[model samples]
Target: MRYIVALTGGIGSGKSTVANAFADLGINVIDADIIARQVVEPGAPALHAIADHFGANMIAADGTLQRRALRERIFANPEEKNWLNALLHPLIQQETQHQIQQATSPYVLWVVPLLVENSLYKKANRVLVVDVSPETQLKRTMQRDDVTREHVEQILAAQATREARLAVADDVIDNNGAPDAIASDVARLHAHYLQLASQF
Candidate 1:
């Protein structure tokens, strides 16, 4: 496996901002969240299994998975949630491992929003967390749409708590931003990661 730096944060906690900063500095960034979606796409075995259990309505006429409908089914209750998690989590993990093995870069910057919740922190050589207050997360995310108040609350409740995230972190980036602050945070860490990548 490659030297992997897994980054995570709450929804609206500025993960993209930090991830892109590292990208600008020329790092191979692997987004595991996208892989989570990819494994359940049309023709994927995971999707086939889901449709069998949840019915074909989970897939649209055009053949893409119905995200909203699926989310409602899983997040609506506990038993169904466990069923979906059992099906998808292992598949996602396998794909994530494959992608990490394919990286040609010196070190991989792996981004996963639910890294802590999925218990994937152990896979990383280093864990970089973007931290911000829950109040900030709520306020900034509230400005976005189709993203109702209840939806945001559900996301917040579902994700790992701030203390739990930090507990697993090797280092932390405070995304409670001031102008141009993130750039310095990133530049400083960039070299540190390069050095650590060698040692690890």
Candidate 2:
């Protein structure tokens, strides 16, 4: 396994923008979201437990996880929410570890959204946050999602607060700068990560 740099933030905080910038530098970006989906494949252990808890309806006839249906179930039931999180979180982390082991690079840019919320930062070598304030988050997400401000606000509050994420950040990409500024910010971080990983 390689030294891992986690690029994390709440929704609409430009996580992909930063990760993609790293990817363009030839750094491998291991996305938690992608691995989250992969771990629930047809024959995975979590898939078996998922059906046992929620029954066959939670699985498509083709054996795929019924994401839309399960989302509604968990969203509507707080108890169900806890159950699913307990089951899926560790599996996601396990698979994430496996992915990092196969990576061929000086470091892996691990893209995680709930790193702060789940204390997942403890598993990485460094933490990188795409910091954006709640006011900025509301405006950008609402515009992009075309949803009501209140809904966007609710979603924003559901994640780690801005200060919470900033508290654990080893580095923060100040997202308030000009649009083109990210390229340089990422490039600088790339060099820093390369130098840091060399010591490992």
Candidate 3:
């Protein structure tokens, strides 16, 4: 297997930017959220299971799952969140492993938003945490998603704490600077990760 370097961060922590920083260098990247969407598309078993549990109202007339409704449901209920994770995580993991196995790059970077909270540290050879302040997180999420501060704070409370994340990080990128600076930092990590992969 290629050396799997998982990149994780809180919501609005600029993970996509870092992932793209590595991706621009030709690293194979698989996103858990994107894969989750794929699994719940119109025809997939996940979509059917979701509709079964949440009612056909969870889906569109066109047979596509209503992601916003589903998300609101999950956020409002912990049991529902677990149930959804139970349904989706395994599928996402399977596809992620499959992609990692088939990657032709020197290594791979898996972008997992809930990586730390889900206790997925063992799945990677190394963990890179993209760090941003809590205030920044709330601001960015509110600005980008048009969500309320209370809602954003609820999201922050649900994820693993900054201390917990840093405790497990092998490499940490402080993403408070401009894009050029952030990209430079990621480029440096990219070279180092490739070197580490070579060692494996």
Candidate 4:
């Protein structure tokens, strides 16, 4: 098995930006969120189960599930959020494991936004936390998603706090800087990771 480096962070913390940098360096980056979406695509067992349990309202007219609508529902209601996670986490976990096992790189950088909060970091050989302050996260998220402060706060509430995530991190990317600087940091980290992976 390849060495697994899981990437995690709170909303708007630049986890995807770092993951893309790793990808640019030819590192295998397996995104759990992407797999989560794939598992819920039309005709998948997960979709069928969700439709049955939550009713067909979750399904979009385009046949794809309305992920945004689902998020809005869950974020506003705790029971719905837990129920949805219960329905989807197993499927997402299975697919995530499958993808990691099949990775064709020296090591894999698994992008899992909720890795710390969800305890998914334990599965990785190394955990890379993309660090940013909660205030910055909230501001960035509000701007990025064009959402209200309450919505951003709710998103933050669902994630591990910055300090909490940093406490568990084996590596960290300080993404409070400009995008170009962040890119440079990722390039350096990519080289460092490659060197580390080659030894295994």
Candidate 5:
């Protein structure tokens, strides 16, 4: 397999912006969030498994997963959250591996917001953490998600702290400023990664 760089960040830290910048440069990017949605698409076996276990209330009338309800339910109950992860983690991991195997770029960007929490740090040839201050993260997330500060804090509490993410990073992308700056950084890393991939 080609060299893989795992990109991680806390919520609202601009990982999506960095990933999109990489994509604009024609780099391959595989995202766990996208894969998570695909695994529970209406007809997928994972969706069926989820509905069967969580009951039909977890499934919308139109057949899509009721993500908000399920999110609330799981977050409220540790056992239920663990049970759901046990069911879906294998499926997500299998698909993530399959997608990585199929990546065509010199190096693939695997974006996982929970990389540290899930112990996925060991899988990457390099780790990139998009860094931002807690205040920035809170403001951006509350504005972008239309959530209260308390809600944002709750989500942030469930993720790795800024220090924890930075501790494991091979490189850091400071994204506390303009989009142009972040894009330029991504371009620099693109060349750097190509060189790294060649040596691999």
Candidate 6:
């Protein structure tokens, strides 16, 4: 197995930016969010299970999953959110591990936004957090998602806290700077991870 570095951060904390930077250097990067979407694809068992539990209304007439409606349903109720997680998390985990095992890079950068809140963090040889302030998180997320401040707040509130993420971090990238600065930081980590992977 490649030495796995699980990269995490709060919403809008520039995790994707950092991951893309690493990918440009030829690192194999697997994203949990991407896998999560794949698991719920139109004909996937998870999608059918979701439709069964949340009612057929969660599915579109075209047979695709209605992501927005389901998100709204879960976000409004903790029980529904937990129920959805119970159905999807394991499926997402299975696919994530399969992809990780198939990676050909000397090391893999696993982008997991909810790393600190989930058991997936344990699979990482090292944890890297892309850190930013609450103000930045709210501003970026709201702008990027075209969502209200309150909506962004609710999303942030559900994720692991910044303090909690940092507490588990083996490394932290303070992403409150320019893209070049962030890229330079990733370049350094890339070199360091190569060295660490060799040791493994």
Q: How many clashes in each candidate?
A: 0, 0, 0, 0, 0, 0
Off by more than 4 A, model 3 = 52-54, 60-89
Local distance difference test, each candidate: 0.87, 0.86, 0.88, 0.82, 0.90, 0.88
User: Alpha carbon lDDT of residue 150, candidate 5?
Assistant: 96
Candidate 2 residue runs with Cα over 4 Å from true position: 41-45, 59-90
Tell me the tens digit of each residue's lDDT in model 1 across 1-200: 67999999998897889988888888878998788778987798999999999988899878989988999888868999999889887888788888778877778899988889978899899999999988778877998555777878988998899999999999998987653678778999999988999888
Task: For each candidate, give its TM-score against the true structure.
Answer: 0.82, 0.82, 0.84, 0.80, 0.86, 0.84
lDDT of 2 at 31: 92
Model 5, TM vs. native: 0.86
Model 5, runs deviating above 4 Å: 66-86
Encode model 3's per-residue lDDT on 51-157: one tens digit a residue: 88998789987878888889888897999999998988888879888998888899899888888888888889999999999988988899999999999999899
lDDT of 4 by residue, 1-200 (tens): 67888888888886777888888778788988889779899998888877787778889999999777677767878888888888887887787778878878778998888787777777887888888888888788888889999988887787677788888898888887667777788877777777887886
Question: Where is the poorest 10-residue window by lDDT in model 4?
Answer: 176-185
Estimate, for each residue in 36-116, the C-alpha lDDT of model 6 and write its tens digit: 878988989999898888899999888888989999889969998998888887888788879888888899999988888
Name the runs in model 1 displaced over 4 angstroms.
Answer: 43-45, 60-63, 67-87, 146-151
Task: Give the higher-TM-score candidate: 1 or 3.
Answer: 3
TM-score: the better of candidates 1 and 2:
1
Which scores greater on lDDT, model 1 or model 4?
1
Question: Least lDDT summed over 10 consecutive residues: which range in candidate 1?
Answer: 176-185
lDDT of 2 by residue, 151-183 (tens): 987887789987899899999887754557787
Best by lDDT: 5
**What clash count does candidate 6 reach?**
0
